[PDB]
Design a protein around this ligand. Structure first.
Ligand SMILES: CCC(=O)Nc1cc(Nc2nccc(-c3cn(C)c4ccccc34)n2)c(OC)cc1N(C)CCN(C)C
Length: 311
């Protein structure tokens, strides 16, 4: 299975940085516009620039560019290209509403059952596509899901994503700092990562959204978590979730990895629930909340722009 994905190299004069969005260990990510020459289009883009220019930091962002260029799905983040300047720049589709964790935290009074179940469906679809590509995410969380519109979310952060060939089932890592509260038990004990460990992290992500962004195992540090899950203890039932949804989470948290649901079945179940949302999620004032949408907005002369329609 040859990977005939196309790596597009961008000129720095083809995109303009508008503002800074966030800086930290990764570098600094900018909100900007990509204007391919002569095409009369603009594309809202996120530009991650990574300064020191350490060789390992380069190697890692180019690995991320590889993985992001090898995926094409409506619920997986779009890689547009990279710029090979003094500091390597990573250009992706701009997600104007940010990460889903911050979104559910700062909009919890306006989020209904329909949006929650639809987010679960879309995330399950993106993960099922990643499983189709035999790709293991290893870092699925509400922080690693970005919001294009309140009606459309996409999986992101492929820094730990690992591809497998046709016959291979597991991934073994070593000495890498890991999000322990989202990991399956077999990944904590033996550093084994499969698509079913991604299902476990999917269950933790669903629990995150149903609790409107509460941190799992809030008071407990990492050390106890392993044995705590060996005792049979799991995350509690969120107050808004019927037993139908909490059962899905619990099945995602089974010790036997083959007993957990598959992402296609999660798509099916959350689809059934999404057609009658308030039968499965009880939210006070659910019945008329409004979440925003684009109003042809932002700062200047945006008469010729789009993003998921540039092919
Ligand atoms: C992480 C917090 C966040 O999401 N910031 C954010 C991001 C985007 N857009 C976007 N698109 C693609 C990638 C990224 C991105 C990828 N990485 C790895 C990042 C790291 C830091 C910051 C952004 C990114 N960000 C946005 O749209 C204009 C607005 C915001 N805010 C101002 C927040 C709003 N505040 C109320 C919550």
């Amino acid at each position: 299975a040859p990977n005939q994905a196309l790596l597009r190299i961008l000129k720095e004069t083809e995109f303009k940085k508008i503002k800074v969005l966030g800086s930290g260990a990764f570098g600094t990510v900018y909100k900007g516009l990509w204007i391919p020459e002569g095409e009369k289009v603009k594309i809202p883009v996120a530009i991650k620039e990574l300064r020191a220019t350490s060789p390992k930091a380069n190697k890692e962002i180019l690995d991320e560019a590889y993985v992001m260029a090898s995926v094409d799905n409506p619920h997986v983040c779009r890689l547009l290209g990279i710029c090979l300047t003094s500091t390597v720049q990573l250009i992706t589709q701009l997600m104007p509403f940010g990460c889903l964790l911050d979104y559910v935290r700062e909009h919890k009074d306006n989020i209904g059952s329909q949006y929650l179940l639809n987010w679960c469906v879309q995330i399950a679809k993106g993960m099922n596509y990643l499983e189709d590509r035999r790709l293991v995410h290893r870092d699925l969380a509400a922080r690693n899901v970005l919001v294009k519109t309140p009606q459309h979310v996409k999986i992101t952060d492929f820094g730990l994503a690992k591809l497998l060939g046709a016959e291979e089932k597991e991934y073994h890592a070593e000495g890498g700092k890991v999000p322990i509260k989202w990991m399956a038990l077999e990944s904590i004990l033996h550093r084994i990562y499969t698509h079913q460990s991604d299902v476990w992290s999917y269950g933790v992500t669903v629990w995150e959204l149903m609790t409107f962004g509460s941190k799992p195992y809030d008071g407990i540090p990492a050390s106890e978590i392993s044995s705590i899950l060996e005792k049979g203890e799991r995350l509690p039932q969120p107050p808004i979730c019927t037993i139908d949804v909490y059962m899905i989470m619990v099945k995602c948290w089974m010790i036997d990895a083959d007993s957990r649901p598959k992402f296609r079945e999660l798509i099916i179940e959350f689809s059934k629930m999404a057609r009658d949302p308030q039968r499965y999620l009880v939210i006070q004032g659910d019945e008329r909340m409004h979440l925003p949408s684009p109003t042809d907005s932002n700062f200047y002369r945006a008469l010729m722009d789009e993003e998921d329609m540039d092919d």
